[PDB]
Every structure is written in structure tokens, then in C-alpha cells.
Design a protein around this ligand. Structure first.
Ligand SMILES: CC(C)CN(C[C@@H](O)[C@H](Cc1ccccc1)NC(=O)O[C@H]1CCOC1)S(=O)(=O)c1ccc(N)cc1
Lengths: 99, 99
């Protein structure tokens, strides 16, 4: 599907039988989700945003469905103002910018 | 043009005779550029993201050239780690997301 940008590019994602809303963010290198419980061994990590660095929990090889498109990769969970799908998963579903 | 996301979507932008590298960011509602002395009246503002908030100066009606594409709109100037071209300007040059 082709998405215009007059509105926030929000999509419904499915992760762990749960349905959440997330923003397709080409400005984020990684995928960062709001606090939630994911299964598996996670490792502490720190990422930097526009306002500074935060601590997050890193989960590897996580299956996530983005508008019916399957991706399997790294997902960071922590204090983000909103769920964002970064380039690590966008590239998996073949997302590109056009103009 | 078609930009893939294997790497950061960096592009060349022209502002006030100055050419800079900026990120095409569908995740940014508004454009935010690193500190620079732009002429004109401006309004103080606080924007937040990962890590918290930063104070920026809002300028309106600023002419910008994104990869040879003419655009004119609001621009936020402050201590941002990275220059970001947001949806406000992305919609102007007809940029879309595809997959
Ligand atoms: C989705 C959230 C974070 C909100 N914004 C968009 C994001 O794309 C933002 C862009 C950015 C990249 C690198 C350094 C600094 C900023 N990336 C971000 O945090 O990347 C992290 C998450 C994983 O990988 C790296 S924002 O920058 O706060 C923002 C908010 C308001 C305006 N008006 C303009 C920009």
C-alpha cells in the first residue's frame, strides 16, 4: 500500500497475539516499543533519541506482523513516547520512500 | 526517486544558501534543524521524543530545497543531534511510503 504523509503513518501491528498501534518511522534506526511483556532472554541496552539516552530491554528475533507483512528481528522495549517501527523492520517488509 | 532503507535516508537540503545533510523522517511531525541563525521572528517551543524534550525556535514560511524540490514551511531550530525533514515538508514534495 502507498501511504501519504498528511497524517501520522500509523499502522496496526501484531506481536504476541496482541494488537498494538505503531508509527512507521524512517528516522529511527531501530524498532522501539512501549513497556510490555515479551517472552525470552533480553539484554539491557541504551539508545539515544532527540532528547537524550534511555535504557531499554533488547529482544532478539521477534516475529512481528505489520499490516499483514511478516518480519522477524530485534525489538527494543522501553520508555518511548510512542511505538515506532524502525529501519531494521521496515527493510524486511520492503518499505521504501518515493517522491 | 526511490530511497531504500538499508541505510539512513540522508539527503541534501538547501536553506539560506547553506546546503546540509538531512534525514527524511516520516516519524517527525515537523522539521527540526540544528542551530543556525535564521532571520525573522520566531516563537519558543518544546518538542519531545526519546530521551525527553528540547527547546527549539519555531520559524514560519522558510524556503527549503530538498533534492532539487521546492518546499516552504515551518522549521524548528534547536540542539538536535540530527537534522530532520518532517511530514510537514515531506507532503510538499509529494513523498510517500511504499511496500
Ligand atoms: C518517533 C519519535 C522518536 C519521535 N521523532 C522521530 C524519530 O524519527 C527520531 C529522529 C532522530 C534520530 C537520531 C537522533 C535524533 C532524532 N528517531 C529516534 O528517536 O531514533 C532512535 C530510536 C531507534 O533508533 C534511534 S523525534 O525525533 O523526537 C521528533 C519529534 C518532533 C519533531 N517535531 C521532530 C522530531
Amino acid at each position: 500500500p502507498q501511504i501519504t504523509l498528511w497524517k501520522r503513518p500509523l499502522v496496526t501491528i501484531r506481536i504476541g497475539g496482541q494488537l498494538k498501534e505503531a508509527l512507521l518511522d524512517t528516522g529511527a534506526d531501530d524498532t522501539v516499543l512501549e513497556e510490555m511483556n515479551l517472552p525470552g532472554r533480553w539484554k539491557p541496552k541504551m539508545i539515544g533519541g532527540i532528547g537524550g539516552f534511555i535504557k531499554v530491554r533488547q529482544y532478539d528475533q521477534i516475529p512481528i506482523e505489520i499490516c499483514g507483512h511478516k518480519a522477524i528481528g530485534t525489538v527494543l522495549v522501553g520508555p518511548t513516547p510512542t511505538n515506532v517501527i524502525g529501519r531494521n523492520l521496515l527493510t524486511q517488509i520492503g518499505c521504501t520512500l518515493n517522491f
